[PDB]
Short mmCIF file of C-alpha atoms in Angstrom, two decimals:
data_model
loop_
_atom_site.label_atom_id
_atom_site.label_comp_id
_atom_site.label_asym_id
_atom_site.label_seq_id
_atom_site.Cartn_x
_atom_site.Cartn_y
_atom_site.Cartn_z
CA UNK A 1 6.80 -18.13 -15.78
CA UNK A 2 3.55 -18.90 -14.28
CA UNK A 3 1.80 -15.74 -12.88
CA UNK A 4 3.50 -12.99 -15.02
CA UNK A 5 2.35 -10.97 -17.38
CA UNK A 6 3.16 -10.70 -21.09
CA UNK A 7 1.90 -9.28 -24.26
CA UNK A 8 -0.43 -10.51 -27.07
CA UNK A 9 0.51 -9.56 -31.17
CA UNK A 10 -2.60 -10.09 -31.91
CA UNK A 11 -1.78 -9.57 -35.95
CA UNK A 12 0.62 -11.92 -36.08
CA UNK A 13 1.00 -14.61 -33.00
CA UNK A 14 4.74 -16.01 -34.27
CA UNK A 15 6.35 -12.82 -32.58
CA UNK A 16 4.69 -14.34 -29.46
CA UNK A 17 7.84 -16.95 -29.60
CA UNK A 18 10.44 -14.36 -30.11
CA UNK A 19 9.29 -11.39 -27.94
CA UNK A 20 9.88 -13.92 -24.35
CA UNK A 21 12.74 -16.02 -24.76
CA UNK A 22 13.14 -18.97 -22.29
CA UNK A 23 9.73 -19.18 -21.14
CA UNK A 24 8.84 -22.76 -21.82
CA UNK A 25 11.98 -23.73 -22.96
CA UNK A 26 12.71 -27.84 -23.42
CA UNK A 27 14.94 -29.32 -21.18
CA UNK A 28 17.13 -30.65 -24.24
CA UNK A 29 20.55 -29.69 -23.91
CA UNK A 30 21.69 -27.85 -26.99
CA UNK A 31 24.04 -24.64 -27.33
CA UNK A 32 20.84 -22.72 -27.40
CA UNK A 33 18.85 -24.35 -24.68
CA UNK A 34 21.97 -24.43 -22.22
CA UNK A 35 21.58 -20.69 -22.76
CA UNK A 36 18.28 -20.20 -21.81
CA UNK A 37 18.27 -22.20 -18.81
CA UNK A 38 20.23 -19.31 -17.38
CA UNK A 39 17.23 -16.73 -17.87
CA UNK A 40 15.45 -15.28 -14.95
CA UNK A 41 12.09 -15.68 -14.69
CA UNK A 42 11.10 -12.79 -13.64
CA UNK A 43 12.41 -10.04 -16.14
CA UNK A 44 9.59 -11.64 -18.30
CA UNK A 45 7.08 -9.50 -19.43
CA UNK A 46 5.67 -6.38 -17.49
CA UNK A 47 7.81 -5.45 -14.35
CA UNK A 48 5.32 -2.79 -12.22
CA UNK A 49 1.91 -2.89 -11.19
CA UNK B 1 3.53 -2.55 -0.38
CA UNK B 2 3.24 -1.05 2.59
CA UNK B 3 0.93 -2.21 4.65
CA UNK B 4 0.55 0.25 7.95
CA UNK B 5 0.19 3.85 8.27
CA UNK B 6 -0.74 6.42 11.27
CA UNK B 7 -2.30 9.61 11.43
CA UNK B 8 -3.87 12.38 13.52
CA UNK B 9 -7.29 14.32 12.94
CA UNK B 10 -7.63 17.87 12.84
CA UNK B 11 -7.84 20.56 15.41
CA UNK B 12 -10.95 22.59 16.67
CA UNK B 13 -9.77 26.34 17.42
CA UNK B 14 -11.49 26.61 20.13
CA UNK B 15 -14.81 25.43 18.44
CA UNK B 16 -16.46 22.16 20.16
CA UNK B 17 -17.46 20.42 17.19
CA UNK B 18 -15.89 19.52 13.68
CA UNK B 19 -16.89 22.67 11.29
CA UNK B 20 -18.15 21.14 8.35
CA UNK B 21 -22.04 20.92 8.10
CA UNK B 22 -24.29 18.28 5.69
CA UNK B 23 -24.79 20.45 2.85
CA UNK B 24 -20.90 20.12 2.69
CA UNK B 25 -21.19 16.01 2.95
CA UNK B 26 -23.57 16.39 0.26
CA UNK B 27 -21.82 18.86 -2.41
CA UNK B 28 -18.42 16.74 -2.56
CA UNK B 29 -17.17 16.79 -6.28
CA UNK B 30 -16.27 12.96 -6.38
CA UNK B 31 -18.68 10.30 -6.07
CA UNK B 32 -22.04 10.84 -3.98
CA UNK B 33 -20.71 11.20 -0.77
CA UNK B 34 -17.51 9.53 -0.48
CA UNK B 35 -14.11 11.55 0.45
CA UNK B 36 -11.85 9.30 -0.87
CA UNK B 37 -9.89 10.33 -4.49
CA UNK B 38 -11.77 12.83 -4.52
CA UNK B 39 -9.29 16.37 -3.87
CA UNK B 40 -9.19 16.91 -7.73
CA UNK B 41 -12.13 16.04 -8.55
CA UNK B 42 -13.37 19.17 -8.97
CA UNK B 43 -11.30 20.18 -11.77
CA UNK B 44 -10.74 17.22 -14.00
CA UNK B 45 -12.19 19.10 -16.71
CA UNK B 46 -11.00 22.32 -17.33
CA UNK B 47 -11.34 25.84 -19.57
CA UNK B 48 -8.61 28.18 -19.23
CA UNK B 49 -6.53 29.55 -16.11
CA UNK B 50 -9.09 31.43 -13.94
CA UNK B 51 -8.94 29.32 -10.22
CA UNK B 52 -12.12 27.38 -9.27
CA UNK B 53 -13.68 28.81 -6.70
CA UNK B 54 -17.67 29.37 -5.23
CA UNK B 55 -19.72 31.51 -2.41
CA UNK B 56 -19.33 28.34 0.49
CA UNK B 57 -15.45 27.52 -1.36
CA UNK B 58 -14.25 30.68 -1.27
CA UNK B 59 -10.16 29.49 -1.98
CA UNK B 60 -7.87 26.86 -3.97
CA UNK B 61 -7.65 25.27 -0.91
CA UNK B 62 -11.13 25.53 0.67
CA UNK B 63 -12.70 22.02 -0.79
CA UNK B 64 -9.38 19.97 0.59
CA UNK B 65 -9.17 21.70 3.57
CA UNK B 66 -13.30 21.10 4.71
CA UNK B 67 -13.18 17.10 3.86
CA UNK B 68 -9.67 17.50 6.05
CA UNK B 69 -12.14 18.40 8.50
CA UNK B 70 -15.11 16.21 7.47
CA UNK B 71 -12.84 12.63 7.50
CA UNK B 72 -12.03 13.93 11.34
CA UNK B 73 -15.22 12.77 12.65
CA UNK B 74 -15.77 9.66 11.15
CA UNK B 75 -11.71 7.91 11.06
CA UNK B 76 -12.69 6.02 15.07
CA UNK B 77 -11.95 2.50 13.46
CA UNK B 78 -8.36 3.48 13.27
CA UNK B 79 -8.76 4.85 16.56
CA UNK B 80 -11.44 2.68 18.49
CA UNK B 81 -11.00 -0.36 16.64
CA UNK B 82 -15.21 0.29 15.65
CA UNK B 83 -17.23 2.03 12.99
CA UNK B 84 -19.34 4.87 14.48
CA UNK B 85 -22.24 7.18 13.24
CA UNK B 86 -22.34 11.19 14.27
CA UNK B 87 -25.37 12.98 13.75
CA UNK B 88 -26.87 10.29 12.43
CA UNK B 89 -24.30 9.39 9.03
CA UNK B 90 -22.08 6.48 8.99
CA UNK B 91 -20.18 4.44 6.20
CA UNK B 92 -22.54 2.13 3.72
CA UNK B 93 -20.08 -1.17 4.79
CA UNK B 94 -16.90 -2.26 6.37
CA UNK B 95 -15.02 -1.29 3.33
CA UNK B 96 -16.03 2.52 3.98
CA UNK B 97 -17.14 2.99 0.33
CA UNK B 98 -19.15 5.74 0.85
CA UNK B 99 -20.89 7.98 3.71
CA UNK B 100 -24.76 6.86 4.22
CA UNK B 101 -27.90 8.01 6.89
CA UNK B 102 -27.77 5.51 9.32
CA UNK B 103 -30.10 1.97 8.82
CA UNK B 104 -32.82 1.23 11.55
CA UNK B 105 -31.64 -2.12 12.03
CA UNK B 106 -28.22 -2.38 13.54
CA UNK B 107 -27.12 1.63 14.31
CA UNK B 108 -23.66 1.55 15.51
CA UNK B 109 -22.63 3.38 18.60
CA UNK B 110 -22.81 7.29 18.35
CA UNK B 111 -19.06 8.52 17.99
CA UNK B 112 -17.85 10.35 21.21
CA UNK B 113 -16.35 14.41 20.06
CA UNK B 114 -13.06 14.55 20.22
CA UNK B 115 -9.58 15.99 18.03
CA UNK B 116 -6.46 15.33 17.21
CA UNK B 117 -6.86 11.61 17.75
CA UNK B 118 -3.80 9.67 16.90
CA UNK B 119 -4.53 7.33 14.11
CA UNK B 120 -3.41 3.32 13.24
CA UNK B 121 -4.31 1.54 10.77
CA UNK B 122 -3.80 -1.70 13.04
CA UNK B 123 -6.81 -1.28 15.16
CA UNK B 124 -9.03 -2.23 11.87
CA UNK B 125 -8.10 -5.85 11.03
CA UNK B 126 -10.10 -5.96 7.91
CA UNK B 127 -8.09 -2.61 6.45
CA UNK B 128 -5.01 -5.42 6.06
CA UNK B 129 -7.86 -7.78 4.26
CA UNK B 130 -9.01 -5.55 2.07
CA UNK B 131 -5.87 -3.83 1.14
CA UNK B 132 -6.59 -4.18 -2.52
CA UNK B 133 -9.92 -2.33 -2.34
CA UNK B 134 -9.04 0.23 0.73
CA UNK B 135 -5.69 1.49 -1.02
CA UNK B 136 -6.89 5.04 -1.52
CA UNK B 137 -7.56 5.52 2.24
CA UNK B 138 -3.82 5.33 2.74
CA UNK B 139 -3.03 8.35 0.60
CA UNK B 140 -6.05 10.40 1.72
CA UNK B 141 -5.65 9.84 5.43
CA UNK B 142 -2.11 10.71 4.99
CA UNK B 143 -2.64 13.60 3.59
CA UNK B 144 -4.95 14.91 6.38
CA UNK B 145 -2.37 14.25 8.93
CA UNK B 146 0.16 16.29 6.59
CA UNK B 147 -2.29 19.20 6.50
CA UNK B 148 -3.29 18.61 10.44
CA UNK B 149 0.39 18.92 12.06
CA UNK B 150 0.41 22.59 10.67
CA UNK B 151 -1.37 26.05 11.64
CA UNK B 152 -0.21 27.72 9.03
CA UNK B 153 0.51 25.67 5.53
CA UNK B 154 0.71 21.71 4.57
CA UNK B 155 4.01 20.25 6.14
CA UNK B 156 6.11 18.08 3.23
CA UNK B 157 9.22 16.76 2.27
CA UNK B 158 12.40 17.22 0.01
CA UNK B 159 15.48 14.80 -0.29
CA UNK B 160 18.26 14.36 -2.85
CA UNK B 161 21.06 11.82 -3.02
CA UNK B 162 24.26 11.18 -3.90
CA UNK B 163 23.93 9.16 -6.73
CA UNK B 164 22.88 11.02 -9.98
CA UNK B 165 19.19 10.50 -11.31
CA UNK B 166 19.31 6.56 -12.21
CA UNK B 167 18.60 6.25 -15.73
CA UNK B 168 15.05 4.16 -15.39
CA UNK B 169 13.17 7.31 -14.23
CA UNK B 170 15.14 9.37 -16.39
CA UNK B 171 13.07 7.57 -19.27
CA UNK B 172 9.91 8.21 -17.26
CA UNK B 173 10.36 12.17 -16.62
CA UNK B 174 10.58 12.58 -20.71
CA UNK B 175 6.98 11.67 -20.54
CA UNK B 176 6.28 14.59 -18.71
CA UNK B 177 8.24 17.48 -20.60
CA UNK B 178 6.03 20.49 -21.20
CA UNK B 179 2.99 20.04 -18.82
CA UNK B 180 2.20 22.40 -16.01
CA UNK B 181 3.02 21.56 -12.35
CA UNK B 182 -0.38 21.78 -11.12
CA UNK B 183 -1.27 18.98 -13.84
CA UNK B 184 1.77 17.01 -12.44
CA UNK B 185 -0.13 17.19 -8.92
CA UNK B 186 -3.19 15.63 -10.46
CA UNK B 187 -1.45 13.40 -11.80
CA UNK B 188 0.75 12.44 -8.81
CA UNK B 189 -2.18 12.12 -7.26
CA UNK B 190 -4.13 10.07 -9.44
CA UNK B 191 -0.85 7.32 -9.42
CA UNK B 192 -0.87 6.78 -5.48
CA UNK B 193 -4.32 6.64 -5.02
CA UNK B 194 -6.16 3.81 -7.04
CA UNK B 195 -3.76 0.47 -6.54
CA UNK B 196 -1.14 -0.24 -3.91
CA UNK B 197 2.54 0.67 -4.94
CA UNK B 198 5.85 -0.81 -3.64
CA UNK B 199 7.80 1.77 -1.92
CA UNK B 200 10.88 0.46 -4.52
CA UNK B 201 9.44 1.55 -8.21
CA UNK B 202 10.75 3.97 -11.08
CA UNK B 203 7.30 5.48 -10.75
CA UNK B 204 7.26 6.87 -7.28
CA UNK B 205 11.23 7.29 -7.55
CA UNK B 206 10.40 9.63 -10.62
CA UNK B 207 7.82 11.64 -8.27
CA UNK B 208 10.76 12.02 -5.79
CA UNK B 209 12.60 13.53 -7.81
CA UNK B 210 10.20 15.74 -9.83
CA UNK B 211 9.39 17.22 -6.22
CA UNK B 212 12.94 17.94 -5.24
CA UNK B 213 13.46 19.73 -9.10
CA UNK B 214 10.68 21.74 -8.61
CA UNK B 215 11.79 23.52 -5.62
CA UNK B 216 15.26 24.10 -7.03
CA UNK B 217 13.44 25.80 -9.78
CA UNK B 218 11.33 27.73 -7.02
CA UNK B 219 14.31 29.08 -5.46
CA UNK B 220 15.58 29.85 -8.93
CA UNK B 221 19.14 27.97 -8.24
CA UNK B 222 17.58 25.49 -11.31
CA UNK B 223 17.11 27.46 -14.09
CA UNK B 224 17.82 26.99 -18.23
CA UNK B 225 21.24 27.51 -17.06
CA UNK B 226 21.88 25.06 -14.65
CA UNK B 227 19.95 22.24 -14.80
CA UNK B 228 19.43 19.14 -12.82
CA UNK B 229 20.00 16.75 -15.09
CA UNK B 230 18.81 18.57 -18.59
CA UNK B 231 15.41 19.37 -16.60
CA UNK B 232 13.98 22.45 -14.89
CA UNK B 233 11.05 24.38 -14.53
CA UNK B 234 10.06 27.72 -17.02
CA UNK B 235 8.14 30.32 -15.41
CA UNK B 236 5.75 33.15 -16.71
CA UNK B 237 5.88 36.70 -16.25
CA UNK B 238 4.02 37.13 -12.80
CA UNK B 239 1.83 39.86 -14.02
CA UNK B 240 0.02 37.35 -16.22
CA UNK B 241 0.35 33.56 -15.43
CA UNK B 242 1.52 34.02 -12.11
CA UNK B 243 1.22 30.54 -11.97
CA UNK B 244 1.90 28.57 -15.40
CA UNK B 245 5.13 26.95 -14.64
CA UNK B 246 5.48 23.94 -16.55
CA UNK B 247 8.59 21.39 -17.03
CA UNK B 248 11.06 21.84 -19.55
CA UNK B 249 14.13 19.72 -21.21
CA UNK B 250 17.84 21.33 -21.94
CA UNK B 251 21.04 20.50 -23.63
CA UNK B 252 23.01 22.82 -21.05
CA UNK B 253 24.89 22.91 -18.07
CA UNK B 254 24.24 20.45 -15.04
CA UNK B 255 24.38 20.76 -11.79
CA UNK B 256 26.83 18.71 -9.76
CA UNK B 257 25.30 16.06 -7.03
CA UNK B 258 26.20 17.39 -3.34
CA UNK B 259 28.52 16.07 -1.19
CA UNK B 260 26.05 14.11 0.97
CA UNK B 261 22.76 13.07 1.02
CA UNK B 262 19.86 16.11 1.72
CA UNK B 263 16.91 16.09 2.81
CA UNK B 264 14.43 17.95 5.11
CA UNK B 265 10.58 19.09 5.73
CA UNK B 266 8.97 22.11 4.22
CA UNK B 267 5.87 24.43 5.15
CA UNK B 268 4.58 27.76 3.99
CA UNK B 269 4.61 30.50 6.71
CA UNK B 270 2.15 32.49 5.57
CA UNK B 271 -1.31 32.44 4.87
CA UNK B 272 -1.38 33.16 0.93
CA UNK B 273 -0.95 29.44 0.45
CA UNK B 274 -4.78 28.64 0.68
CA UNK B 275 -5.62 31.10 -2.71
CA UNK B 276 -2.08 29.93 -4.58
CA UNK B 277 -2.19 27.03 -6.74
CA UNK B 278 1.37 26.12 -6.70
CA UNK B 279 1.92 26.12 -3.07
CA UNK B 280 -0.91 23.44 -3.01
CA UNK B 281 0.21 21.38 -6.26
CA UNK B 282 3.96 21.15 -4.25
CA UNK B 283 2.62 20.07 -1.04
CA UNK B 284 0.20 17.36 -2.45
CA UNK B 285 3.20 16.25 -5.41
CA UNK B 286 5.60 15.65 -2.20
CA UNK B 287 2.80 14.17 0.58
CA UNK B 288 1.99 11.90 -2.48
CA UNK B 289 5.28 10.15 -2.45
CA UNK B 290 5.54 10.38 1.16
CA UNK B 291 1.89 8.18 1.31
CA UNK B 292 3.45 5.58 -0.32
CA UNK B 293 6.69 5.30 1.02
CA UNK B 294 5.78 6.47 4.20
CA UNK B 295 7.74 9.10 6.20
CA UNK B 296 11.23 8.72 6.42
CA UNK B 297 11.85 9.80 9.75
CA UNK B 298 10.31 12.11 12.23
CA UNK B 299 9.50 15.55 12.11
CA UNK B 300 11.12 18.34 14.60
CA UNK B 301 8.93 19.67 17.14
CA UNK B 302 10.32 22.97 17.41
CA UNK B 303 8.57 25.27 15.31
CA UNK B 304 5.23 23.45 15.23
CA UNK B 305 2.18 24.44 16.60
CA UNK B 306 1.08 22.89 20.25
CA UNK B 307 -1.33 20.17 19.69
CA UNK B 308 1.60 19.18 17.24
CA UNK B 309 4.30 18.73 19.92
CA UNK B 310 5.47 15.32 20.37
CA UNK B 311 2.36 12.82 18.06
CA UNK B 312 3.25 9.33 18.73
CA UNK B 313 4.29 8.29 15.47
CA UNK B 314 4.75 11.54 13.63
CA UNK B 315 7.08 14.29 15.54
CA UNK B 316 9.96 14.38 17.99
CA UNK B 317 12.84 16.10 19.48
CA UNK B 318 15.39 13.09 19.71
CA UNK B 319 18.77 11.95 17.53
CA UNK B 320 17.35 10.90 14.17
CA UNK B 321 14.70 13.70 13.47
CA UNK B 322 14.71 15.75 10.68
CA UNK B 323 14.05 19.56 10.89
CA UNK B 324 11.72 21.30 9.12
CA UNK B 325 12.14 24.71 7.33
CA UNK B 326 9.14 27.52 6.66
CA UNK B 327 9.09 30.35 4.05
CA UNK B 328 7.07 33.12 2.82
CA UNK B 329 6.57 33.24 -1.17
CA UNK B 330 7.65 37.13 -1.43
CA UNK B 331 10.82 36.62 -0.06
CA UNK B 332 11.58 33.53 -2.14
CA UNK B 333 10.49 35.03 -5.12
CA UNK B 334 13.46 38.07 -4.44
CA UNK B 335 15.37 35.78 -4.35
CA UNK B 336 14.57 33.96 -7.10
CA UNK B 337 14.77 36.95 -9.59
CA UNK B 338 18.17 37.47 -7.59
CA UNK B 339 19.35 34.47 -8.81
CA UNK B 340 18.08 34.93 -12.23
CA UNK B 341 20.02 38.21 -12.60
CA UNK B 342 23.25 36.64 -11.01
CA UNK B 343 23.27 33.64 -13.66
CA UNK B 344 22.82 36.42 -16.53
CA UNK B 345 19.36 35.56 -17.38
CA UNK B 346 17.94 39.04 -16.85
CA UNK B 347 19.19 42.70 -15.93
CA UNK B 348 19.09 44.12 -12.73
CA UNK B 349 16.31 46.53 -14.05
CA UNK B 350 14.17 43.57 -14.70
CA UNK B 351 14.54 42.35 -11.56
CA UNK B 352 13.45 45.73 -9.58
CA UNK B 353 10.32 45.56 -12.24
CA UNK B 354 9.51 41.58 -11.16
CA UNK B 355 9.65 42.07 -7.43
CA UNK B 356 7.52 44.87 -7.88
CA UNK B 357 4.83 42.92 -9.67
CA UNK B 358 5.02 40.08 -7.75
CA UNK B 359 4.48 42.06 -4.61
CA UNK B 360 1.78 43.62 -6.19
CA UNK B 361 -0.04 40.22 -6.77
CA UNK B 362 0.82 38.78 -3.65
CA UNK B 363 -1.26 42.10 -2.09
CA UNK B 364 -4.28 41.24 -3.85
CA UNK B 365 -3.94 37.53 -2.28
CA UNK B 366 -3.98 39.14 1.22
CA UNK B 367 -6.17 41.41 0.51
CA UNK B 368 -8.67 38.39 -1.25
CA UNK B 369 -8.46 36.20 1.72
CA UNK B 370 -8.65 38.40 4.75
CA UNK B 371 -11.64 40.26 3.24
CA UNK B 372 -12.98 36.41 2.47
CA UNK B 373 -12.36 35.52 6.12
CA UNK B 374 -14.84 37.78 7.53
CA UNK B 375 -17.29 36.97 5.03
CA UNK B 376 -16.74 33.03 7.14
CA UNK B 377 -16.47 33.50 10.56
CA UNK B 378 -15.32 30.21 12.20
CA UNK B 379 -18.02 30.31 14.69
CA UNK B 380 -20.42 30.22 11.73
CA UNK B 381 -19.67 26.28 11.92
CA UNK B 382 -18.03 24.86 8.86
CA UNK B 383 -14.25 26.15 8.32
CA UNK B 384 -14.12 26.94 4.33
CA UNK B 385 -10.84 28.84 5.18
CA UNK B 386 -8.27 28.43 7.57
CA UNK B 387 -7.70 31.83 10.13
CA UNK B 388 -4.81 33.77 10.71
CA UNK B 389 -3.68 36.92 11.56
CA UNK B 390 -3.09 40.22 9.41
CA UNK B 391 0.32 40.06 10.90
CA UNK B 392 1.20 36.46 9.40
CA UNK B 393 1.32 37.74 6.00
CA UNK B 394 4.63 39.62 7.15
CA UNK B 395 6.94 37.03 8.75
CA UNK B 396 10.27 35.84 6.68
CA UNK B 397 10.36 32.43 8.73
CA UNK B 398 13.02 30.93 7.38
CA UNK B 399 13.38 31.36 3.73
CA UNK B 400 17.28 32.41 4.40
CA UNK B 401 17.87 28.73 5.10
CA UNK B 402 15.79 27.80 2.48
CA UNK B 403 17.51 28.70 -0.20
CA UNK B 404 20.34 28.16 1.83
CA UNK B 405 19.30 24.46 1.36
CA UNK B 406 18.74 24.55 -2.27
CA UNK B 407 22.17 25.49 -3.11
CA UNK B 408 23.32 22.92 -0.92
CA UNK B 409 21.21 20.78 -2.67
CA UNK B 410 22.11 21.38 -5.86
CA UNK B 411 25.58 22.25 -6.61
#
């Protein structure tokens, strides 16, 4: 995800972890992770200039 | 992004030198002496409806149309590859920041008189190098050439498709319900010129369509009974307001996409344009998109002036070129009331009483302008106000097949 942009929740920094799934996810392989390894990277974040 | 653009400077009638003098280079509303984002400057701040207007920028369309003519003299690198000085005034750097008197170290050549240069942005390398930083020159330079290719009224462009308005910009127009169109224009404006766009965005998308809506509302086939997709534009009574037509949302009817795909260039065929608001908020909505995405295809020679016939990268006569259609405002706005009356929204009474009003008004923009002509005679040497003839302020053009279009358009 290197090179987009994303958002900050200041007051609280947990949502941080919620608001962008699969950025950063471990390469485990649980139900979960399998998942995620199928997100595209670049619907992260902000999409225009 | 898109990275090339071409252009074409204005022309002299009959004059031998571009008519704009240095009290003009020094008054610009913007920054000190620099052109560029600067065609609303002059406004950004605001108190009620009257138009802005002075002694030496007599009209609407008087401030636009004299740095049309003061970027003609000083756009050679996109013709001669070099940055040149006239009368002793050239850019502060490479980046063309800002206009400056000339330094007494290394004075770049004198720039040789000339018009209706053909412009590309290829013959200046560093343009491409400093694309981040030069962005605004694409929209500005555009919009000169837009203004250039016409005697008589900014040329721009209208297209629909097929497909109804995606839902992304639908999301986007909502942001925009209740505010009038010549505050759209600013803001249209303001969106193409500071950072480069991709042609592909739900911004200039959005635009698109806000330009084509507003001239099925200008035609009256859009009204709060038929609506393009829950949007049209509300107008005033044109004895007060002539000009306050701002965006609204409805629950009602829509109108039905067309059958195929529309699209085609627009002018104004008679002179009231440069004292009428509107006619300039369309033209610079519509050239904005245009600037980004660049022109779709080439514009038909026929009805254009002479120095317009056949511009390298701009008009043509062959297979894919679209035509262009012309209109006068008193026509259009029978017709509009017509419509109005024939969709129920007023009686035919009302209708004799609003063409009657609005002919009324249009007189006093005649009679404004040709007496401000006089007061500006071209060979004075700056051109606050473009000339015509008493006799353009009759002609039809062809506002039959305009609104011809618009109910093709939307159906």
């Amino acid at each position: 995800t290197s090179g987009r942009m994303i958002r900050a929740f200041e007051g609280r920094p947990e949502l941080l972890a919620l608001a962008y799934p699969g950025r950063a996810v471990l390469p485990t392989q649980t139900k979960n992770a399998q998942f995620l390894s199928t997100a595209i990277a670049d619907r992260i974040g902000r999409l225009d200039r | 992004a898109q990275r090339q653009f071409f252009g074409l400077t204005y022309n002299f009638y009959g004059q031998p030198a571009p008519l704009f003098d240095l009290n003009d280079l020094q008054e610009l509303a913007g920054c000190y002496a620099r052109p560029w984002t600067s065609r609303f400057s002059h406004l950004a701040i605001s108190t009620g409806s009257l138009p802005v207007w002075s002694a030496r920028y007599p009209s609407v369309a008087s401030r636009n149309i004299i740095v049309n003519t003061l970027l003609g003299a000083h756009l050679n690198p996109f013709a001669g590859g070099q940055v040149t000085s006239h009368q002793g005034i050239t850019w502060r750097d490479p980046v063309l920041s800002s206009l400056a008197p000339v330094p007494a170290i290394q004075p770049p050549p004198v720039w040789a008189v000339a018009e209706n240069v053909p412009l590309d942005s290829n013959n200046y390398p560093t343009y491409v190098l400093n694309l981040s930083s030069m962005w605004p020159i694409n929209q500005d330079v555009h919009i000169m050439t837009m203004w250039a290719l016409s005697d008589q009224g900014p040329i721009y462009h209208l297209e629909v498709p097929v497909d109804p308005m995606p839902a992304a910009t639908t999301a986007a127009l909502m942001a925009y319900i209740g505010v009038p169109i010549a505050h759209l224009a600013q803001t249209a404006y303001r969106f193409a010129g500071q950072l480069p766009q991709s042609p592909d965005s739900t911004m200039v998308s959005t635009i698109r369509w806000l330009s084509a809506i507003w001239f099925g509302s200008l035609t009256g086939r859009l009204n709060r009974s038929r609506t393009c997709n829950g949007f049209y534009f509300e107008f005033a009574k044109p004895a007060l307001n002539p000009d306050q037509a701002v965006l609204k949302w409805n629950d009602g009817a829509r109108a039905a996409p067309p059958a195929a795909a529309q699209s085609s260039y627009m002018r104004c065929i008679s002179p009231h344009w440069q004292h009428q608001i509107v006619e300039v908020a369309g033209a610079l909505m519509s050239q904005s998109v245009t600037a980004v995405t660049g022109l779709p295809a080439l514009i038909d020679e026929a009805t254009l002036p002479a120095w317009s016939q056949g511009v390298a990268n701009l008009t043509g006569n062959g297979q894919g070129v679209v035509p262009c259609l012309d209109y006068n405002p008193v026509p259009m706005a029978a017709a509009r009331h017509l419509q109005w009356r024939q969709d129920g929204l007023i009686t035919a009474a009302q209708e004799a009483q609003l063409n009657n009003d609005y002919t009324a008004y249009a007189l006093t923009i005649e009679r404004h302008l040709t007496a401000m002509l006089v007061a500006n005679p071209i060979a004075a040497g700056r051109m606050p106000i473009q000339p015509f003839n008493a006799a353009d302020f009759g002609q039809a053009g062809q506002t039959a097949a305009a609104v011809a279009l618009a109910q093709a358009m939307f159906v």
